[PDB]
């Protein structure tokens, strides 16, 4: 159903990894993956919902469906306790699927004693995502050679967003914040939603009504990622989900991607990862290294600026009008749960190197020419990426 599939898209970066199917041969794969589907990282939204409903209960202010909602929220509070930020069973099976289709699509690459390396951040959901992925790989071919490592030593290429002080300030206090808040006031109409759950929804101040509804969307958006057999998606109409998504999509765009208000600073900070991608590929191409694949497990704030910095079409657009961002830039197409980028390298009969870019396992486009899409000349692509890195360094030089 197109309605239910649109509602899933409106979960934004909390969308579960989409459904993918099986199916020449690459000699190398260069990979970046976000962790799989996870529990919420913060109790703030759930607490806010429970607090508002509990006060309404003591005021005898709940509708029949509001009482049903409160009972559910108390249950979720018990089920989420001790589980915040953890990879879910669904998150493991997403990684098993991504690895599984890779192995079946390219059996020759991972055959015999092929060599692979994986790295992850120090964050458990990303370590455990790498392990679900690696376990699948080893199950299919126990003769793989496997190097596994993780931790803060990879902060420079996987958590660059924590290391640049101008970006940290921008993320926390930047000029995007008033724009986001104004956009929320325009998009979000709380009274229809609160009318389902609360008697006299009009007695609530606009700000607390907004905050309650925003929190409830947040709880409902993350529940499909937890492997808990409970659902809140029908609380909202398709239009209401659409409006909520528009606000969160704008937040991700402005805080983490190419919005004009960010002056490309949020994108520029990813250049060390793009540099390391090129370096690992060049060493395999030359023979200095003989890895068949490099895998990397990290975060949405790793993937989003990395994709924009590569210049994948429709991901680095600099949209001048906030209300237009949703038409041109879709975070669920870029960084859903388990979002991943794969560079597949090929050698043709004349020994020329070609690369194919997969974004969530579908061919992605670069703003350079090729006579045989989706394959790009590696020479052309490397030069293009090196120019992107040089641009990124210039951008960072203008913000200390």
mmCIF file of C-alpha atoms in Angstrom:
data_model
loop_
_atom_site.group_PDB
_atom_site.id
_atom_site.type_symbol
_atom_site.label_atom_id
_atom_site.label_comp_id
_atom_site.label_asym_id
_atom_site.label_seq_id
_atom_site.Cartn_x
_atom_site.Cartn_y
_atom_site.Cartn_z
ATOM 1 C CA UNK A 1 0.000 0.000 0.000
ATOM 2 C CA UNK A 2 1.350 3.400 -1.031
ATOM 3 C CA UNK A 3 -0.150 5.020 2.098
ATOM 4 C CA UNK A 4 1.593 2.745 4.604
ATOM 5 C CA UNK A 5 4.842 2.953 2.661
ATOM 6 C CA UNK A 6 4.647 6.756 2.728
ATOM 7 C CA UNK A 7 3.954 6.663 6.467
ATOM 8 C CA UNK A 8 7.116 4.572 6.945
ATOM 9 C CA UNK A 9 9.150 7.081 4.912
ATOM 10 C CA UNK A 10 7.874 9.838 7.206
ATOM 11 C CA UNK A 11 9.878 8.284 10.049
ATOM 12 C CA UNK A 12 12.852 9.986 8.356
ATOM 13 C CA UNK A 13 16.203 8.854 9.732
ATOM 14 C CA UNK A 14 14.236 6.458 11.972
ATOM 15 C CA UNK A 15 12.803 4.614 8.954
ATOM 16 C CA UNK A 16 13.811 0.920 9.063
ATOM 17 C CA UNK A 17 16.187 -0.072 6.314
ATOM 18 C CA UNK A 18 13.995 -0.581 3.212
ATOM 19 C CA UNK A 19 13.339 -3.938 1.633
ATOM 20 C CA UNK A 20 15.993 -5.010 -0.885
ATOM 21 C CA UNK A 21 16.234 -8.007 -3.233
ATOM 22 C CA UNK A 22 19.043 -10.225 -4.480
ATOM 23 C CA UNK A 23 20.739 -9.225 -7.735
ATOM 24 C CA UNK A 24 30.403 -8.422 -13.844
ATOM 25 C CA UNK A 25 32.327 -8.926 -10.617
ATOM 26 C CA UNK A 26 34.067 -6.233 -8.553
ATOM 27 C CA UNK A 27 37.576 -6.733 -7.230
ATOM 28 C CA UNK A 28 37.069 -4.465 -4.200
ATOM 29 C CA UNK A 29 34.263 -2.982 -2.100
ATOM 30 C CA UNK A 30 34.661 0.178 0.010
ATOM 31 C CA UNK A 31 31.891 0.572 2.582
ATOM 32 C CA UNK A 32 30.378 2.844 5.230
ATOM 33 C CA UNK A 33 27.340 1.730 7.209
ATOM 34 C CA UNK A 34 25.261 3.279 9.910
ATOM 35 C CA UNK A 35 24.329 0.967 12.760
ATOM 36 C CA UNK A 36 21.098 -0.986 12.269
ATOM 37 C CA UNK A 37 17.663 -0.225 13.719
ATOM 38 C CA UNK A 38 18.031 0.884 17.338
ATOM 39 C CA UNK A 39 16.110 1.858 20.448
ATOM 40 C CA UNK A 40 15.645 5.589 21.139
ATOM 41 C CA UNK A 41 18.744 7.224 22.554
ATOM 42 C CA UNK A 42 16.937 9.587 24.950
ATOM 43 C CA UNK A 43 14.034 9.193 27.377
ATOM 44 C CA UNK A 44 13.022 12.863 27.063
ATOM 45 C CA UNK A 45 10.214 12.396 24.537
ATOM 46 C CA UNK A 46 8.672 9.391 26.279
ATOM 47 C CA UNK A 47 8.871 11.102 29.684
ATOM 48 C CA UNK A 48 7.167 14.228 28.320
ATOM 49 C CA UNK A 49 4.290 12.202 26.857
ATOM 50 C CA UNK A 50 3.816 10.205 30.063
ATOM 51 C CA UNK A 51 3.968 13.335 32.226
ATOM 52 C CA UNK A 52 1.264 15.155 30.254
ATOM 53 C CA UNK A 53 -1.008 12.112 30.174
ATOM 54 C CA UNK A 54 -0.504 11.329 33.869
ATOM 55 C CA UNK A 55 -1.506 14.862 34.887
ATOM 56 C CA UNK A 56 -4.542 14.595 32.637
ATOM 57 C CA UNK A 57 -5.389 11.297 34.345
ATOM 58 C CA UNK A 58 -5.248 12.943 37.776
ATOM 59 C CA UNK A 59 -7.459 15.743 36.399
ATOM 60 C CA UNK A 60 -9.835 13.166 34.898
ATOM 61 C CA UNK A 61 -8.908 14.690 31.564
ATOM 62 C CA UNK A 62 -8.363 11.683 29.311
ATOM 63 C CA UNK A 63 -10.595 10.415 26.549
ATOM 64 C CA UNK A 64 -11.124 6.696 26.077
ATOM 65 C CA UNK A 65 -8.274 6.607 23.554
ATOM 66 C CA UNK A 66 -6.145 8.768 25.837
ATOM 67 C CA UNK A 67 -6.467 6.169 28.583
ATOM 68 C CA UNK A 68 -5.444 3.505 26.060
ATOM 69 C CA UNK A 69 -2.474 5.678 25.076
ATOM 70 C CA UNK A 70 -1.381 6.175 28.692
ATOM 71 C CA UNK A 71 -1.500 2.432 29.354
ATOM 72 C CA UNK A 72 0.699 1.897 26.303
ATOM 73 C CA UNK A 73 3.168 4.649 27.276
ATOM 74 C CA UNK A 74 3.649 3.146 30.749
ATOM 75 C CA UNK A 75 4.360 -0.191 29.067
ATOM 76 C CA UNK A 76 6.887 1.356 26.689
ATOM 77 C CA UNK A 77 8.592 3.038 29.641
ATOM 78 C CA UNK A 78 9.135 -0.389 31.213
ATOM 79 C CA UNK A 79 10.237 -1.960 27.917
ATOM 80 C CA UNK A 80 12.658 0.872 27.041
ATOM 81 C CA UNK A 81 14.243 0.918 30.516
ATOM 82 C CA UNK A 82 17.857 -0.232 30.335
ATOM 83 C CA UNK A 83 17.706 -0.507 26.518
ATOM 84 C CA UNK A 84 18.301 3.083 25.368
ATOM 85 C CA UNK A 85 20.449 3.370 22.259
ATOM 86 C CA UNK A 86 20.834 -0.415 21.872
ATOM 87 C CA UNK A 87 20.785 -2.223 18.541
ATOM 88 C CA UNK A 88 17.546 -4.189 18.220
ATOM 89 C CA UNK A 89 16.996 -7.673 16.788
ATOM 90 C CA UNK A 90 15.687 -5.922 13.683
ATOM 91 C CA UNK A 91 18.951 -3.981 13.511
ATOM 92 C CA UNK A 92 20.929 -7.221 13.512
ATOM 93 C CA UNK A 93 18.768 -8.749 10.803
ATOM 94 C CA UNK A 94 19.205 -5.612 8.668
ATOM 95 C CA UNK A 95 22.976 -6.077 8.790
ATOM 96 C CA UNK A 96 22.584 -9.786 8.031
ATOM 97 C CA UNK A 97 20.566 -8.828 4.969
ATOM 98 C CA UNK A 98 23.073 -6.238 3.730
ATOM 99 C CA UNK A 99 25.963 -8.671 4.175
ATOM 100 C CA UNK A 100 23.884 -11.534 2.801
ATOM 101 C CA UNK A 101 23.034 -9.816 -0.478
ATOM 102 C CA UNK A 102 26.632 -8.644 -0.859
ATOM 103 C CA UNK A 103 27.927 -12.225 -0.584
ATOM 104 C CA UNK A 104 25.327 -13.634 -2.953
ATOM 105 C CA UNK A 105 25.762 -10.830 -5.488
ATOM 106 C CA UNK A 106 29.582 -11.151 -5.545
ATOM 107 C CA UNK A 107 30.537 -14.690 -4.486
ATOM 108 C CA UNK A 108 33.862 -14.635 -6.344
ATOM 109 C CA UNK A 109 34.992 -11.537 -4.430
ATOM 110 C CA UNK A 110 34.511 -13.200 -1.016
ATOM 111 C CA UNK A 111 35.594 -16.711 -2.079
ATOM 112 C CA UNK A 112 38.515 -18.792 -0.864
ATOM 113 C CA UNK A 113 40.735 -16.889 1.622
ATOM 114 C CA UNK A 114 39.540 -13.412 0.744
ATOM 115 C CA UNK A 115 40.687 -10.693 3.152
ATOM 116 C CA UNK A 116 38.309 -8.200 4.755
ATOM 117 C CA UNK A 117 38.675 -5.542 7.407
ATOM 118 C CA UNK A 118 35.968 -3.874 9.487
ATOM 119 C CA UNK A 119 36.163 -0.885 11.840
ATOM 120 C CA UNK A 120 33.562 0.676 14.118
ATOM 121 C CA UNK A 121 33.191 3.563 16.553
ATOM 122 C CA UNK A 122 33.252 2.963 20.306
ATOM 123 C CA UNK A 123 29.424 3.089 20.388
ATOM 124 C CA UNK A 124 27.935 -0.353 21.178
ATOM 125 C CA UNK A 125 25.134 -0.261 18.602
ATOM 126 C CA UNK A 126 27.729 0.313 15.882
ATOM 127 C CA UNK A 127 30.139 -2.333 17.236
ATOM 128 C CA UNK A 128 27.267 -4.811 17.456
ATOM 129 C CA UNK A 129 26.160 -3.879 13.930
ATOM 130 C CA UNK A 130 29.636 -4.701 12.598
ATOM 131 C CA UNK A 131 29.499 -8.008 14.463
ATOM 132 C CA UNK A 132 26.095 -8.957 13.023
ATOM 133 C CA UNK A 133 27.479 -8.101 9.594
ATOM 134 C CA UNK A 134 30.775 -9.953 10.109
ATOM 135 C CA UNK A 135 29.070 -13.022 11.611
ATOM 136 C CA UNK A 136 26.975 -13.317 8.458
ATOM 137 C CA UNK A 137 30.087 -13.037 6.286
ATOM 138 C CA UNK A 138 31.968 -15.697 8.247
ATOM 139 C CA UNK A 139 28.975 -18.041 8.254
ATOM 140 C CA UNK A 140 28.892 -17.940 4.453
ATOM 141 C CA UNK A 141 32.688 -18.346 4.087
ATOM 142 C CA UNK A 142 34.576 -19.414 7.240
ATOM 143 C CA UNK A 143 37.835 -19.176 5.253
ATOM 144 C CA UNK A 144 37.684 -15.366 5.055
ATOM 145 C CA UNK A 145 40.556 -13.558 6.751
ATOM 146 C CA UNK A 146 39.015 -10.950 9.042
ATOM 147 C CA UNK A 147 40.460 -7.939 10.857
ATOM 148 C CA UNK A 148 38.056 -6.364 13.368
ATOM 149 C CA UNK A 149 38.767 -3.253 15.397
ATOM 150 C CA UNK A 150 36.946 -0.345 16.914
ATOM 151 C CA UNK A 151 37.080 2.623 19.225
ATOM 152 C CA UNK A 152 38.005 6.258 19.704
ATOM 153 C CA UNK A 153 41.097 5.799 17.524
ATOM 154 C CA UNK A 154 38.666 6.106 14.598
ATOM 155 C CA UNK A 155 37.064 9.342 15.848
ATOM 156 C CA UNK A 156 38.866 11.386 13.190
ATOM 157 C CA UNK A 157 37.228 9.544 10.279
ATOM 158 C CA UNK A 158 33.987 8.220 11.848
ATOM 159 C CA UNK A 159 33.105 10.887 14.453
ATOM 160 C CA UNK A 160 34.569 14.000 12.851
ATOM 161 C CA UNK A 161 31.374 15.780 13.943
ATOM 162 C CA UNK A 162 32.601 15.630 17.561
ATOM 163 C CA UNK A 163 36.089 16.963 16.780
ATOM 164 C CA UNK A 164 35.476 20.240 14.910
ATOM 165 C CA UNK A 165 34.747 22.969 17.445
ATOM 166 C CA UNK A 166 33.037 25.338 15.004
ATOM 167 C CA UNK A 167 30.697 22.557 13.949
ATOM 168 C CA UNK A 168 29.938 21.578 17.551
ATOM 169 C CA UNK A 169 29.007 25.200 18.255
ATOM 170 C CA UNK A 170 26.888 25.315 15.092
ATOM 171 C CA UNK A 171 25.087 22.082 15.965
ATOM 172 C CA UNK A 172 24.328 23.380 19.456
ATOM 173 C CA UNK A 173 23.689 27.110 18.986
ATOM 174 C CA UNK A 174 23.703 27.832 15.254
ATOM 175 C CA UNK A 175 21.445 30.061 13.194
ATOM 176 C CA UNK A 176 19.446 27.039 11.982
ATOM 177 C CA UNK A 177 17.664 26.781 15.334
ATOM 178 C CA UNK A 178 15.252 29.753 14.961
ATOM 179 C CA UNK A 179 14.423 28.613 11.421
ATOM 180 C CA UNK A 180 13.592 25.113 12.636
ATOM 181 C CA UNK A 181 11.455 26.434 15.494
ATOM 182 C CA UNK A 182 9.495 28.761 13.195
ATOM 183 C CA UNK A 183 8.970 25.926 10.704
ATOM 184 C CA UNK A 184 7.601 23.705 13.471
ATOM 185 C CA UNK A 185 5.146 26.415 14.556
ATOM 186 C CA UNK A 186 3.942 26.646 10.960
ATOM 187 C CA UNK A 187 3.725 22.946 10.104
ATOM 188 C CA UNK A 188 2.419 21.376 13.299
ATOM 189 C CA UNK A 189 -1.243 21.740 14.288
ATOM 190 C CA UNK A 190 -1.526 20.068 17.718
ATOM 191 C CA UNK A 191 -5.233 20.405 18.582
ATOM 192 C CA UNK A 192 -6.577 17.739 16.161
ATOM 193 C CA UNK A 193 -4.034 15.242 17.533
ATOM 194 C CA UNK A 194 -4.520 16.117 21.192
ATOM 195 C CA UNK A 195 -8.300 16.031 20.719
ATOM 196 C CA UNK A 196 -7.992 12.245 20.284
ATOM 197 C CA UNK A 197 -6.455 11.821 23.741
ATOM 198 C CA UNK A 198 -7.366 14.771 25.976
ATOM 199 C CA UNK A 199 -10.533 16.537 27.084
ATOM 200 C CA UNK A 200 -10.358 20.305 26.530
ATOM 201 C CA UNK A 201 -7.271 20.279 24.274
ATOM 202 C CA UNK A 202 -7.818 24.004 23.650
ATOM 203 C CA UNK A 203 -6.951 24.850 27.282
ATOM 204 C CA UNK A 204 -3.323 23.870 26.586
ATOM 205 C CA UNK A 205 -0.855 26.599 25.687
ATOM 206 C CA UNK A 206 0.362 26.391 22.090
ATOM 207 C CA UNK A 207 3.923 25.693 23.225
ATOM 208 C CA UNK A 208 3.096 22.799 25.537
ATOM 209 C CA UNK A 209 0.631 21.433 22.970
ATOM 210 C CA UNK A 210 3.406 21.540 20.349
ATOM 211 C CA UNK A 211 5.932 19.911 22.683
ATOM 212 C CA UNK A 212 3.522 17.112 23.631
ATOM 213 C CA UNK A 213 2.644 16.319 20.026
ATOM 214 C CA UNK A 214 6.278 16.533 18.871
ATOM 215 C CA UNK A 215 7.259 14.108 21.645
ATOM 216 C CA UNK A 216 4.461 11.683 20.731
ATOM 217 C CA UNK A 217 5.553 11.666 17.071
ATOM 218 C CA UNK A 218 9.087 10.916 18.295
ATOM 219 C CA UNK A 219 7.943 7.888 20.319
ATOM 220 C CA UNK A 220 5.827 6.643 17.437
ATOM 221 C CA UNK A 221 8.608 7.183 14.880
ATOM 222 C CA UNK A 222 11.163 5.073 16.788
ATOM 223 C CA UNK A 223 8.933 2.206 17.974
ATOM 224 C CA UNK A 224 9.185 0.293 14.625
ATOM 225 C CA UNK A 225 12.974 0.102 15.209
ATOM 226 C CA UNK A 226 12.800 -1.675 18.573
ATOM 227 C CA UNK A 227 11.449 -5.161 17.679
ATOM 228 C CA UNK A 228 8.618 -4.569 20.174
ATOM 229 C CA UNK A 229 5.232 -5.820 18.850
ATOM 230 C CA UNK A 230 3.451 -2.543 19.566
ATOM 231 C CA UNK A 231 2.485 0.151 17.084
ATOM 232 C CA UNK A 232 1.550 3.830 17.351
ATOM 233 C CA UNK A 233 1.629 4.803 13.679
ATOM 234 C CA UNK A 234 -2.183 4.894 13.259
ATOM 235 C CA UNK A 235 -2.511 7.631 15.884
ATOM 236 C CA UNK A 236 -1.751 10.079 13.041
ATOM 237 C CA UNK A 237 -3.165 10.689 9.583
ATOM 238 C CA UNK A 238 -0.928 10.549 6.531
ATOM 239 C CA UNK A 239 -0.991 14.351 6.376
ATOM 240 C CA UNK A 240 0.048 14.662 10.016
ATOM 241 C CA UNK A 241 2.969 12.258 9.528
ATOM 242 C CA UNK A 242 3.927 14.197 6.401
ATOM 243 C CA UNK A 243 4.069 17.473 8.336
ATOM 244 C CA UNK A 244 6.056 15.970 11.200
ATOM 245 C CA UNK A 245 8.543 14.474 8.757
ATOM 246 C CA UNK A 246 8.933 17.831 7.021
ATOM 247 C CA UNK A 247 10.080 19.385 10.307
ATOM 248 C CA UNK A 248 12.559 16.615 11.203
ATOM 249 C CA UNK A 249 13.879 16.419 7.637
ATOM 250 C CA UNK A 250 14.574 20.166 7.839
ATOM 251 C CA UNK A 251 16.367 19.702 11.176
ATOM 252 C CA UNK A 252 18.652 17.010 9.716
ATOM 253 C CA UNK A 253 19.222 19.016 6.527
ATOM 254 C CA UNK A 254 20.151 22.206 8.317
ATOM 255 C CA UNK A 255 22.156 20.736 11.183
ATOM 256 C CA UNK A 256 23.955 17.987 9.277
ATOM 257 C CA UNK A 257 23.937 18.657 5.521
ATOM 258 C CA UNK A 258 24.236 21.338 2.836
ATOM 259 C CA UNK A 259 21.678 23.971 3.936
ATOM 260 C CA UNK A 260 22.728 27.554 3.065
ATOM 261 C CA UNK A 261 22.385 28.503 6.734
ATOM 262 C CA UNK A 262 25.213 26.055 7.533
ATOM 263 C CA UNK A 263 27.569 27.515 4.870
ATOM 264 C CA UNK A 264 28.584 23.892 4.030
ATOM 265 C CA UNK A 265 30.466 23.607 7.352
ATOM 266 C CA UNK A 266 28.425 20.500 8.293
ATOM 267 C CA UNK A 267 29.481 18.853 5.038
ATOM 268 C CA UNK A 268 33.118 20.005 4.957
ATOM 269 C CA UNK A 269 33.941 18.257 8.238
ATOM 270 C CA UNK A 270 33.642 14.850 6.551
ATOM 271 C CA UNK A 271 36.662 15.277 4.280
ATOM 272 C CA UNK A 272 38.955 12.981 6.361
ATOM 273 C CA UNK A 273 36.585 10.067 5.695
ATOM 274 C CA UNK A 274 36.484 10.783 1.978
ATOM 275 C CA UNK A 275 40.271 11.029 2.057
ATOM 276 C CA UNK A 276 40.557 7.652 3.780
ATOM 277 C CA UNK A 277 38.105 6.058 1.318
ATOM 278 C CA UNK A 278 40.276 7.177 -1.605
ATOM 279 C CA UNK A 279 43.487 6.069 0.118
ATOM 280 C CA UNK A 280 42.224 2.568 0.915
ATOM 281 C CA UNK A 281 41.002 2.135 -2.668
ATOM 282 C CA UNK A 282 44.234 3.396 -4.201
ATOM 283 C CA UNK A 283 46.283 0.988 -2.092
ATOM 284 C CA UNK A 284 44.204 -1.999 -3.222
ATOM 285 C CA UNK A 285 44.363 -0.866 -6.853
ATOM 286 C CA UNK A 286 48.155 -0.589 -6.731
ATOM 287 C CA UNK A 287 48.687 -3.863 -4.880
ATOM 288 C CA UNK A 288 50.139 -2.221 -1.762
ATOM 289 C CA UNK A 289 47.135 -3.707 0.057
ATOM 290 C CA UNK A 290 45.294 -6.900 -0.890
ATOM 291 C CA UNK A 291 42.008 -6.451 0.986
ATOM 292 C CA UNK A 292 38.907 -7.527 -0.924
ATOM 293 C CA UNK A 293 36.749 -5.204 1.211
ATOM 294 C CA UNK A 294 36.929 -2.462 3.836
ATOM 295 C CA UNK A 295 33.840 -2.031 6.022
ATOM 296 C CA UNK A 296 33.106 0.802 8.465
ATOM 297 C CA UNK A 297 30.312 1.024 11.039
ATOM 298 C CA UNK A 298 29.246 4.354 12.469
ATOM 299 C CA UNK A 299 26.346 6.810 12.505
ATOM 300 C CA UNK A 300 23.829 8.937 10.663
ATOM 301 C CA UNK A 301 25.980 11.961 11.341
ATOM 302 C CA UNK A 302 28.807 10.058 9.614
ATOM 303 C CA UNK A 303 26.737 9.070 6.590
ATOM 304 C CA UNK A 304 24.776 12.286 5.915
ATOM 305 C CA UNK A 305 27.756 14.682 5.447
ATOM 306 C CA UNK A 306 29.853 11.976 3.731
ATOM 307 C CA UNK A 307 27.136 11.492 1.095
ATOM 308 C CA UNK A 308 26.770 15.237 0.597
ATOM 309 C CA UNK A 309 30.532 15.636 0.323
ATOM 310 C CA UNK A 310 30.699 12.935 -2.347
ATOM 311 C CA UNK A 311 28.198 15.025 -4.295
ATOM 312 C CA UNK A 312 25.695 12.203 -4.856
ATOM 313 C CA UNK A 313 22.974 13.963 -6.803
ATOM 314 C CA UNK A 314 20.082 15.276 -4.679
ATOM 315 C CA UNK A 315 22.144 15.148 -1.461
ATOM 316 C CA UNK A 316 24.316 18.303 -1.584
ATOM 317 C CA UNK A 317 21.640 20.709 -2.859
ATOM 318 C CA UNK A 318 21.737 24.142 -1.218
ATOM 319 C CA UNK A 319 18.062 24.989 -0.970
ATOM 320 C CA UNK A 320 17.470 28.640 -0.259
ATOM 321 C CA UNK A 321 13.857 28.354 1.000
ATOM 322 C CA UNK A 322 13.264 26.231 4.134
ATOM 323 C CA UNK A 323 9.741 25.316 3.045
ATOM 324 C CA UNK A 324 11.155 23.861 -0.201
ATOM 325 C CA UNK A 325 13.765 21.573 1.362
ATOM 326 C CA UNK A 326 11.366 18.609 1.540
ATOM 327 C CA UNK A 327 10.857 18.640 -2.230
ATOM 328 C CA UNK A 328 14.566 18.431 -3.019
ATOM 329 C CA UNK A 329 16.255 16.583 -0.123
ATOM 330 C CA UNK A 330 14.830 13.444 1.551
ATOM 331 C CA UNK A 331 16.605 12.144 4.636
ATOM 332 C CA UNK A 332 14.865 8.742 4.459
ATOM 333 C CA UNK A 333 16.525 8.259 1.068
ATOM 334 C CA UNK A 334 19.930 9.134 2.556
ATOM 335 C CA UNK A 335 20.189 7.956 6.179
ATOM 336 C CA UNK A 336 17.477 5.478 7.206
ATOM 337 C CA UNK A 337 18.362 2.887 9.837
ATOM 338 C CA UNK A 338 21.311 0.827 8.592
ATOM 339 C CA UNK A 339 21.999 3.412 5.839
ATOM 340 C CA UNK A 340 25.098 2.462 3.853
ATOM 341 C CA UNK A 341 27.357 3.596 1.013
ATOM 342 C CA UNK A 342 29.234 1.038 -1.092
ATOM 343 C CA UNK A 343 31.858 1.785 -3.749
ATOM 344 C CA UNK A 344 32.226 -1.215 -6.049
ATOM 345 C CA UNK A 345 35.449 -1.314 -8.070
ATOM 346 C CA UNK A 346 35.776 -3.135 -11.389
ATOM 347 C CA UNK A 347 38.558 -3.836 -13.867
ATOM 348 C CA UNK A 348 37.428 -4.161 -17.482
ATOM 349 C CA UNK A 349 39.121 -6.190 -20.229
ATOM 350 C CA UNK A 350 41.521 -3.352 -21.067
ATOM 351 C CA UNK A 351 42.438 -3.076 -17.361
ATOM 352 C CA UNK A 352 40.581 0.231 -16.903
ATOM 353 C CA UNK A 353 39.186 0.824 -13.409
ATOM 354 C CA UNK A 354 35.467 1.589 -13.021
ATOM 355 C CA UNK A 355 33.574 2.393 -9.818
ATOM 356 C CA UNK A 356 29.869 2.065 -9.022
ATOM 357 C CA UNK A 357 28.368 3.959 -6.060
ATOM 358 C CA UNK A 358 25.508 2.321 -4.167
ATOM 359 C CA UNK A 359 23.478 4.354 -1.674
ATOM 360 C CA UNK A 360 21.370 1.914 0.326
ATOM 361 C CA UNK A 361 22.109 -0.690 -2.366
ATOM 362 C CA UNK A 362 20.810 1.364 -5.300
ATOM 363 C CA UNK A 363 22.963 3.003 -7.961
ATOM 364 C CA UNK A 364 23.747 6.660 -7.167
ATOM 365 C CA UNK A 365 24.591 9.474 -9.583
ATOM 366 C CA UNK A 366 27.587 11.886 -9.549
ATOM 367 C CA UNK A 367 27.561 15.200 -11.442
ATOM 368 C CA UNK A 368 30.240 13.966 -13.887
ATOM 369 C CA UNK A 369 29.866 12.304 -17.250
ATOM 370 C CA UNK A 370 29.918 8.599 -17.996
ATOM 371 C CA UNK A 371 29.112 6.696 -21.169
ATOM 372 C CA UNK A 372 27.909 3.619 -19.223
ATOM 373 C CA UNK A 373 25.906 4.594 -16.162
ATOM 374 C CA UNK A 374 25.960 3.424 -13.374
ATOM 375 C CA UNK A 375 29.708 2.810 -13.856
ATOM 376 C CA UNK A 376 32.048 5.794 -13.575
ATOM 377 C CA UNK A 377 35.695 6.056 -14.535
ATOM 378 C CA UNK A 378 37.699 5.790 -11.323
ATOM 379 C CA UNK A 379 40.239 8.315 -12.651
ATOM 380 C CA UNK A 380 37.459 10.862 -13.241
ATOM 381 C CA UNK A 381 35.781 10.050 -9.907
ATOM 382 C CA UNK A 382 38.966 10.292 -7.847
ATOM 383 C CA UNK A 383 39.796 13.680 -9.381
ATOM 384 C CA UNK A 384 36.248 14.835 -8.655
ATOM 385 C CA UNK A 385 36.423 13.602 -5.042
ATOM 386 C CA UNK A 386 39.843 15.229 -4.546
ATOM 387 C CA UNK A 387 38.366 18.543 -5.675
ATOM 388 C CA UNK A 388 35.533 18.076 -3.154
ATOM 389 C CA UNK A 389 38.093 17.543 -0.392
ATOM 390 C CA UNK A 390 40.022 20.635 -1.410
ATOM 391 C CA UNK A 391 36.779 22.635 -1.349
ATOM 392 C CA UNK A 392 35.974 21.220 2.101
ATOM 393 C CA UNK A 393 39.357 22.312 3.459
ATOM 394 C CA UNK A 394 38.728 25.840 2.131
ATOM 395 C CA UNK A 395 35.318 25.902 3.819
ATOM 396 C CA UNK A 396 36.811 24.875 7.158
ATOM 397 C CA UNK A 397 39.567 27.469 6.763
ATOM 398 C CA UNK A 398 36.933 30.217 6.642
ATOM 399 C CA UNK A 399 35.509 29.033 9.998
ATOM 400 C CA UNK A 400 38.768 28.874 12.010
#
